[PDB]
Design a protein around this ligand. Structure first.
Ligand SMILES: CC(C1=c2cc(NC(N)=O)ccc2=NC1=O)c1ccc[nH]1
Length: 276
């Protein structure tokens, strides 16, 4: 399949923006297919010593083959830029729905929580750790199933993620592992139910302080079995988190009572509950 060029596309609006990339919507002219093309400036990447992060993202996304992950269709480059052609997830980021509808009911947190848990099992089975799992990195497709993205900063068996989601082992020995993604899972569950993340404060140092002290509280309206799960996830000792190897893996995590009624085997075949 001949390599594609910038001229093969009609480019449109900006979809997203980070410190090193811009994601733009594009229509392939020969097929009228829409893609989310991520553009990176080679000079800026180099001067910031990011080449290893860019090659890792490409290499990881090449290995993923599961419906709960954004897909890499093609790459090319011109003189100044790299181009990564990715899935266009029509409905955008999960963070927008948490803001829009404010807070999920138990049916919806349970379903979306389970899709994220299936995703992490697949990722971790490939020996890959995300290290920056968060609502902004969890997208929704036109049919309202999730697609996880942003793999530049992953570790395939140094880096700290987003303040509100970093685990306590990062704030000490500065190490990360599978248990780290499970800590962020517990944070995202909390945020699904309560509408806000567990550890908030006026600046980043104050957040890091709260995390090591495990200083947070549950609302009274918080679903009980979902509170019990969050408590088995937000644990300071990483080896004691539900779903980690030392706790015997995903078997026990999926068996939790909050997931009582879930069929784990075909989630992306199921119709998602409406958000309200
Ligand atoms: C931001 C965004 C999309 C992406 C962001 C991405 N960001 C990233 N850092 O990798 C990656 C892929 C992607 N596909 C999208 O459709 C989006 C917004 C609205 C619809 N899609």
């Amino acid at each position: 399949p001949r390599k594609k060029r910038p001229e093969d596309f009609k480019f449109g609006k900006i979809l997203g923006e980070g410190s090193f990339s811009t994601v733009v919507l594009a229509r392939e002219l020969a097929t009228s297919r829409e893609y989310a093309i991520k553009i990176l400036e080679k000079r800026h990447i180099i001067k910031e010593n990011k080449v290893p992060y860019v090659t890792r993202e490409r290499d990881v996304m090449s290995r993923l083959d599961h419906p709960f992950f954004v897909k890499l269709y093609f790459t090319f480059q011109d003189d100044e830029k790299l181009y990564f052609g990715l899935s266009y997830a029509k409905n955008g980021e999960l963070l927008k729905y948490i803001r829009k509808i404010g807070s999920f009911d138990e049916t919806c947190t349970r379903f979306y929580t389970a899709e994220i848990v299936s995703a992490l099992e697949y990722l971790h089975g490939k020996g890959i750790i995300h290290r920056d799992l968060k609502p902004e990195n969890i997208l929704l497709n036109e049919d309202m199933h999730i697609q996880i993205t942003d793999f530049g900063t992953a570790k395939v068996l140094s880096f700290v993620g987003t303040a509100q989601y970093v685990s306590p082992e990062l704030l000490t020995e500065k190490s990360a592992c599978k248990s780290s993604d499970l800590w962020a899972l517990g944070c995202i569950i909390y945020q699904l139910v309560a509408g806000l993340p567990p550890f908030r404060a006026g600046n980043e140092y104050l957040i890091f302080q709260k995390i090591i002290k495990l200083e947070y509280d549950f609302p009274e309206k918080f679903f009980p079995k979902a509170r019990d799960l969050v408590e088995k996830l937000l644990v300071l000792d990483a080896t004691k988190r539900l779903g980690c190897e030392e706790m015997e893996g995903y078997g026990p995590l999926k068996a939790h009572p909050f997931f009582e009624s879930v069929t784990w085997e075909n989630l992306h075949q199921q119709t998602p509950p409406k958000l309200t």
